[model samples]
Target chain A: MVENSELRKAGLKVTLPRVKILQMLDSAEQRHMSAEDVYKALMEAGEDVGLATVYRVLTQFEAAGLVVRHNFDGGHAVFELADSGAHDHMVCVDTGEVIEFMDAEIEKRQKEIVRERGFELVDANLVLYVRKKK
Target chain B: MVENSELRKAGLKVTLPRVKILQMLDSAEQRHMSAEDVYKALMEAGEDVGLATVYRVLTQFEAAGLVVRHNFDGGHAVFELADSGAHDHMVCVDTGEVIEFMDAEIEKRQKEIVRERGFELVDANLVLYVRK
Candidate 1:
């Protein structure tokens, strides 16, 4: 369980809205969810969170390193927990389904690339989309 | 100088619109341009190209490996020529200006990362935004 103090340590205020937003994200079965998806979920659960508030909270979470945003082909942005562990994504081009996988060799090569670039690699995202054969 | 035959050689039909679009991009001082920006330029030059055509052409160019698109902060997408050469972007977050640079080390590292992933590194775009 994450603590409010931990949020504070991350230079974020312990507001009720922030707490609830984070809690909702943490408890979600699917690690990946768009801001609109989260808002809909909150509404279905009878939570009175505003859409603007959800967007604001997501921006804040992203700024605080609690969330990562991806701009996939759909033109709409998607979000996921930042600390969910290291893995890359493979999306279904036709259905937009996302699958996550971890490749140690890829990670090592990425690190080597950054080292070669003379810059310490901070973060990276690798996404591939494939169409299923009929 | 590029010609219609070159486009055909690239597996693209040598249409007048495609030729003009490619000419505009190739002749532009700025290597990178969004589709909207290109449309505006064409309009300023008194070209009668439709917005839909521009978008369709841009998408076609992208699919044909003649253009690249980026999704930066402002939510609106941007497009640029793909054949210019190898380089990455540094965007001015405040001014919305873009600068391009090539880092050999970064490219090498990226290639290694793909190798490790058991996938061939076909293409990549690295963008860094700085607000000032």
Candidate 2:
């Protein structure tokens, strides 16, 4: 569980909207959501948050490393909370479902590639979109 | 040196615009360019090509693995020829210049991470944006 004090330490004000938004993301069963989807979910739950506020808050969270936004092939962006453990994602092309997975072998190879290129490789993102067999 | 028959073998129709665009990319000193930039370059060279055609051809080339499209930090997309060897890019945040480099150690570590996660690694893109 993330503490509110950590949010303040990240240079974010402890506003009601920010707190509520973070709570919504933390408690969500679906780990990933777009800004528009977040807005709709807030409305369904009887929250009076504006869509612009959703976008702004999400961007702020992203900058603070609280969330990660992925530009999948569909052109729509999705956001997920940053877990302590690093992992990548695989998306179902048909259903827009995301499955998070990680592989140690791939991570090792990636670090090697970065070093060979003379880069420190501060971070990386890998995503694959696949459709299940009919 | 890419030959016309190579394009045909890739299942491309080898039209005048396609050949001209490929030639432009082949001869370019700058290895990366956006579709819009390609269109403007074509016009500067007095080549009569439509913007829509430029986008279409580039997308087709990308699908065929002849080119790669990168969505860097900036919203605008960029494209580059798919070289025979593997490499990654570092973009200048201020001037939009691209520098390509490779690292074998990082590649080995990435493969290990994938194996630990139970995924068969296919391909990856790694881009770093820096301002000088």
Candidate 3:
């Protein structure tokens, strides 16, 4: 009942596997996860959801605006819920933490910079690689 | 002979394909190009460099620090000469042009932001998608 409403809102037909997957993503400790991460988590939880369905459902979620997919510098892609407000990311090189941040000045400057070039900003991505200060 | 000095400095052996590819990259109209881009250009210029060699030579150039590879928002990765200073890129959604820009203020802000989180910056990548 809980996951069904959200799926309907996103225009996705609810099934047992879909409900299970949604619950997994919602209750996950990590907000951003790869498809394989989701699959392994399901297996750990003793769910029957297959790896192939996980990939298909994630793609469907992205297309339905229920999730946002990020293609960071690495070869693997990650997904985050679209419910959060817009922000950028910083990856810690030492600890492998993905930190989300929002800076007003940086956001304003990007708008101005793009306007100066006679083009409107469609989208923007900024990734910061950092290490703990010694 | 002309391109040999640069290759030698980069610690790559000078060969006919290496020299010819280097010359092609140096004289190309577009500063950022893909392997397929270079291959097509070579064929149009009447060069006998095969597609396989183009791919291999490009990989070598990257490892030797003579070129930098960019994995942009798109599927195909692009390469730029390493001789250029560090900068970011903006792709025109309308015209398909790649424009490079470096903003001192943004650079400064990134360092400050990272420091506040008790982390020092190692590297950064920012790509702006724009449309006219």
Candidate 4:
């Protein structure tokens, strides 16, 4: 069940549209999606949500801090769930797929590097583009 | 010497404004700067370059890959020299200072991680926000 409590927790009013959108995002194979990607997926899933509603709901989710938006490349905006603890991303150059990964060593090194420079770490962003070996 | 040949290498026409802007960026204490910062610095240095010229030349440098633009936080865009070989950045939250660093171990580990997942590494971007 797509719990209404999640929306309630985010200070969002639990509406049908909100619940349905949350469910779509929760179960999405591709966790990172654009608004149009979500809208089309909703249509294929037989949901009667409008594209405008999709954008609105996603924007709401972003404002509520339930989702994070990324302008990874060009003008296209990508959205992903923030439920996961801080993690980095890898983009598949061949398929344009997004994969999330967290490395303890990388995280540890970042802190060491910062401290070495006489600064305290606050936050970071790391993105990698890769292709499968031929 | 602020050489005009560097401009020619980027296929940019060597004009006084371009040369001055490049010189400003080269000698500025802060590597990462907003266009307004550049304009103000130029004015303080007794240059009569227009703010419009600053914006246009920055855009031109960006297009020519001589500078890289970053929208790390919000609407305010930041520009940095692309002449430096690939490196990561750390932004000081309190003082707005930008520091650059490259770790061989981190780079090696990234490649290993990607290979473990059956992917060939292409490029990466890493930005760390910090406070002194």
The numbered model that scores best in TM-score is: 1
Residue B88, model 4: lDDT of 81
**Candidate that scores best on DockQ:** 1
Misplaced by over 4 Å in model 3 are: A93-96, A108-124, A131-134, B1-132
DockQ of each candidate's interface versus the true one?
A: 0.03, 0.02, 0.02, 0.02
CAPRI classification of candidate 3: incorrect
User: What are the lDDT scores of the predictions, listed in order?
Assistant: 0.72, 0.74, 0.75, 0.75
**TM-score of every candidate relative to the true structure:** 0.50, 0.47, 0.45, 0.45
Ten residues in sequence with the least summed lDDT for candidate 3 chain B: B71-80
> How many residue pairs clash per model?
5, 47, 0, 0
Of candidates 4 and 1, the better by lDDT? 4
Of the two candidates 1 and 2, the one with more favorable lDDT, higher being better, is 2
Error of 2 at B6 (Å): 32
What share of the reference contacts is kept in model 2?
0.00
- Candidate 1's residue-wise lDDT over B1-132, tens digit each? 346875875698788778877777777846566565677777887776755567677788778777777755444466777754424888765334678878889888999999999999767878786764
Give the runs in model 4 whose Cα sits over 4 Å from its true position.
Answer: A92-95, A111-122, A130-134, B1-132
Q: Give residue B113's lDDT in candidate 3 (0 to 100).
A: 99
- Candidate 4 C-alpha lDDT tens digits along A4-40: 8778888888899998888998888887787768877
